[PDB]
Ligand binder design. Sequence first.
Ligand SMILES: Cc1cc2nc3c(=O)[nH]c(=O)nc-3n(C[C@H](O)[C@H](O)[C@H](O)COP(=O)(O)OP(=O)(O)OC[C@H]3O[C@@H](n4cnc5c(N)ncnc54)[C@H](O)[C@@H]3O)c2cc1C
Ligand SMILES: Cc1cc2nc3c(=O)[nH]c(=O)nc-3n(C[C@H](O)[C@H](O)[C@H](O)COP(=O)(O)OP(=O)(O)OC[C@H]3O[C@@H](n4cnc5c(N)ncnc54)[C@H](O)[C@@H]3O)c2cc1C
Ligand SMILES: *SCCNC(=O)CCNC(=O)[C@H](O)C(C)(C)COP(=O)(O)OP(=O)(O)OC[C@H]1O[C@@H](n2cnc3c(N)ncnc32)[C@H](O)[C@@H]1OP(=O)(O)O
Ligand SMILES: *SCCNC(=O)CCNC(=O)[C@H](O)C(C)(C)COP(=O)(O)OP(=O)(O)OC[C@H]1O[C@@H](n2cnc3c(N)ncnc32)[C@H](O)[C@@H]1OP(=O)(O)O
Ligand SMILES: [Cl-]
Ligand SMILES: [Cl-]
Ligand SMILES: [Cl-]
Ligand SMILES: [Cl-]
Ligand SMILES: [Cl-]
Ligand SMILES: [Cl-]
Ligand SMILES: [Mg+2]
Ligand SMILES: [Mg+2]
Lengths: 437, 437
Amino acid sequence: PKIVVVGAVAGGATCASQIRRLDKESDIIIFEKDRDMSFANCALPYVIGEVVEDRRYALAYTPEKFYDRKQITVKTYHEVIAINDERQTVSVLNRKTNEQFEESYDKLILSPGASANSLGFESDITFTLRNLEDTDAIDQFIKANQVDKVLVVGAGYVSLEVLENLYERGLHPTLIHRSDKINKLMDADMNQPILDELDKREIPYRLNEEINAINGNEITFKSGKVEHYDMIIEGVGTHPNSKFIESSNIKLDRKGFIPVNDKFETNVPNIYAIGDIATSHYRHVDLPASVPLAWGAHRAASIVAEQIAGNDTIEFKGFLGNNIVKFFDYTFASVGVKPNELKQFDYKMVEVTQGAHANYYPGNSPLHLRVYYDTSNRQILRAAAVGKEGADKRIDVLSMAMMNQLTVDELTEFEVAYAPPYSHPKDLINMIGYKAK
Amino acid sequence: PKIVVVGAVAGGATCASQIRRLDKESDIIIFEKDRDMSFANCALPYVIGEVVEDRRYALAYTPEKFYDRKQITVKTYHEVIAINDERQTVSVLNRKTNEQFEESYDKLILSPGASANSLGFESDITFTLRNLEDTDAIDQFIKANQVDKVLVVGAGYVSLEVLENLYERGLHPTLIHRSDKINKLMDADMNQPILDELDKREIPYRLNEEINAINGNEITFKSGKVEHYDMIIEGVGTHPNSKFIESSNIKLDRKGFIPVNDKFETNVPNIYAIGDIATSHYRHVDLPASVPLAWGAHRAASIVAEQIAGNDTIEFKGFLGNNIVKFFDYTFASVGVKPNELKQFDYKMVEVTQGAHANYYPGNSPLHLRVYYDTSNRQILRAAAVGKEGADKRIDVLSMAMMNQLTVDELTEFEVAYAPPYSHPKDLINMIGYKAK
Ligand SMILES: Cc1cc2nc3c(=O)[nH]c(=O)nc-3n(C[C@H](O)[C@H](O)[C@H](O)COP(=O)(O)OP(=O)(O)OC[C@H]3O[C@@H](n4cnc5c(N)ncnc54)[C@H](O)[C@@H]3O)c2cc1C
Ligand SMILES: Cc1cc2nc3c(=O)[nH]c(=O)nc-3n(C[C@H](O)[C@H](O)[C@H](O)COP(=O)(O)OP(=O)(O)OC[C@H]3O[C@@H](n4cnc5c(N)ncnc54)[C@H](O)[C@@H]3O)c2cc1C
Ligand SMILES: *SCCNC(=O)CCNC(=O)[C@H](O)C(C)(C)COP(=O)(O)OP(=O)(O)OC[C@H]1O[C@@H](n2cnc3c(N)ncnc32)[C@H](O)[C@@H]1OP(=O)(O)O
Ligand SMILES: *SCCNC(=O)CCNC(=O)[C@H](O)C(C)(C)COP(=O)(O)OP(=O)(O)OC[C@H]1O[C@@H](n2cnc3c(N)ncnc32)[C@H](O)[C@@H]1OP(=O)(O)O
Ligand SMILES: [Cl-]
Ligand SMILES: [Cl-]
Ligand SMILES: [Cl-]
Ligand SMILES: [Cl-]
Ligand SMILES: [Cl-]
Ligand SMILES: [Cl-]
Ligand SMILES: [Mg+2]
Ligand SMILES: [Mg+2]
């Protein structure tokens, strides 16, 4: 079938590539509104920090190389501006020539993702971070203006990674956030290490703070403070790239996302949606879920490739919401329903803080593991871990437990790999099970 | 019930402690034939390497402290020499006075573990490692003789840990092993990094080599080589501490171990056996299993505590055999049936070698993950991972998957915690799943 894909990055280029692995005959075309396809979204903060300096790690292909390798046509600077689903075409604006045209399709795959929100100030020193064009602009601005002081707005994982990277590059960032609710995917009382790491390095921060006015490099704040900054990076959330979908028959929810079934199909025949734009449900509980992360973009890309050109019996089984972020020496990871979703259940919480490995063994650091479970059936609802070591290991094990409908009590049965450098004979995970009841 | 425990370490002291958590009225007494209770068995190689300096780290309790905190009586230098099972008493030899006496019991818990084997040479420079007395003797001998060249016999994981520690302490070890099957719980081809690490540090080793004769410090080998050594640490296997059990009604297998049911009961009423002395079965396949490691001693300790003083519906579900060892920069971990047991199944092998984390993120290294599955039902039979980073995480996740007899195909559904420093959007575990078709 003739396949058209909208968006040429985590979900889109991946999906197109997976289809080509299975189907060598179909024509596949991807439209991407911006300059680059296949940029490494998750590498961007590290490119800014000069941790990742080889351009080949910043993006995988150019349209020419993608065509040579996979016979997939990718048109960059081409923005889809409407989906004419009844005639099975999309309307595309060639941004280089400013002319539009219709492209027909047998199957349409939507992976437009999200755009960064902006505070809306008229400021030449302010930047958001979403793609490689943004990354290049930020790097160039730092060099052209000999940037030293940078204001980082927002406290989600993107902003935190950007702050760490600016610091490692040798700049002097200050972090502000409109409330005290930083790194929201993690339990609010488990984020203190973020503030401790800032303090330890004397990196200034102010919570319940916002930009009030900008006059050149003079920034006036809500708190009444006035400071001079060379650059501002705003990480104040994202919004779905779905305005171009509104006039079509595709069903969107009130927040602008696309609900899909387990085959990643929209309500319209032959049109699929994957990636950040799509909403589905949790795997372990009967609740809606939206998890705008890379694992989901890649998993959905594979499922849609099977639906179109492979085993169409392969279907999604829902999200668990596994997520993680590094901030200086600490790791913050969680899986399951969000803190705000726990109230939909009668639940109990159990937790343990213990060394990541043998207490007598060097380089140890306390790991805090917390697990929430449903009192009606003892099923695990959510888990969170924070520590300098071993949090990723504990959360991935709990993600596998939740996939298998394990009860909190059965965690005493988990057989950990034990030697002094790695865990304890009764691992933190086993202790959660023993402490449950 | 009056409870008598034989052995005051990983299984025994733990079990007595777990019973006390549930029952504050029963009298509990533990007999330990040697000097110390609750020594840190797994810390011993590190104590020899001076990685663990504070000897307080190698001993968790003394009998006086155990009585003060848990009201449990522990008699060290007291060796149980016979079990008079029909009258429900044990005969105990007070090793300080050489006088024996009987101790009655309502429940008897055997956790005598295993003793180190010896090659049998008449040599004052040869030592074995099993407890803190041994560790003290080795340390004392190194200092008294200014030991430099040391022969480490045996290539099992503990001997390897001893070798690494002797090297880091500043001594010059040479490793020999009677066969080429080093670190036997790991796939043979995946153990090459052990030899690479030895070679990188110019630490000599000879496989399929054995001691022929010992004449003072002059050691003659099977190969015909003659070398002078200041000390020899023999890691030539262990044997069960069951000679004192032979006269009783307890059933022992041909190797001297005690087969137990899922309540860790022996064939004799009121007598339980846990730890290295006990044999059971695998959880995921119908085959016998013996896994003489710490996790099993602690898990059995809790199950026996529930049987005696808690919820008697709690029973063991079998072993998976999760194990791991660190050797210099590498980690070697495996779970499931042993290499030699794979022949009892019709199976296939799938493997991937990929970066432990994002390829562009610093300090990456190649992680080799291998999974064996049963062709009759797609169930995972065994998994092994070797690498400088991430092997423990992948093997613990697979242990959790096996606990639930998960299939190899379902690994595509595992939702990993992804950020650049930790994994990939399609993790190594997911890739095993994608490569299994
Ligand atoms: C700085 C940063 C760090 C991140 N870190 C992590 C992390 O560590 N771990 C993690 O799991 N996730 C991380 N993410 C999230 C991850 O990048 C997204 O979940 C993933 O990119 C979503 O894939 P997608 O295809 O939906 O969107 P994207 O990969 O963003 O691709 C969307 C594409 O479609 C294009 N598009 C939109 N509308 C149109 C249109 N009308 N016509 C043509 N093209 C269009 C856009 O220009 C864009 O190139 C990070 C994201 C960023 C920006
Ligand atoms: C150097 C070393 C390193 C190790 N490293 C690891 C590792 O990294 N990971 C891992 O999982 N496992 C490791 N182990 C294995 C682990 O220590 C054992 O699996 C665990 O100790 C078994 O518990 P147990 O109670 O059966 O035996 P033990 O803990 O050995 O205790 C047995 C006790 O009973 C006593 N006893 C025996 N007979 C009698 C008697 N007749 N009367 C009175 N007392 C008696 C013995 O003196 C001994 O103190 C290691 C062991 C050693 C020695
Ligand atoms: S923010 C974190 C996520 N970031 C991104 O996704 C960045 C944008 N990504 C993309 O644009 C696409 O993901 C690109 C880079 C275009 C390619 O996507 P694929 O996932 O399909 O990758 P490749 O085609 O490059 O495959 C490379 C290696 O993986 C093996 N492989 C892919 N798919 C499969 C399946 N289904 N089964 C088995 N193996 C599979 C390939 O064989 C290949 O290994 P090599 O070592 O290259 O031979
Ligand atoms: S080679 C590796 C194996 N070697 C060894 O284990 C060495 C010898 N071991 C022992 O002698 C025992 O394992 C000792 C050191 C006596 C410990 O026995 P327990 O396992 O029973 O532990 P503690 O009573 O000392 O408890 C320490 C902490 O764990 C919590 N805990 C234990 N058991 C439970 C159960 N069933 N449920 C909830 N919590 C449990 C304790 O409350 C305690 O926590 P703290 O806040 O640190 O007091
Ligand atoms: Cl990336
Ligand atoms: Cl239309
Ligand atoms: Cl705790
Ligand atoms: Cl220990
Ligand atoms: Cl008798
Ligand atoms: Cl039996
Ligand atoms: Mg129309
Ligand atoms: Mg504590």
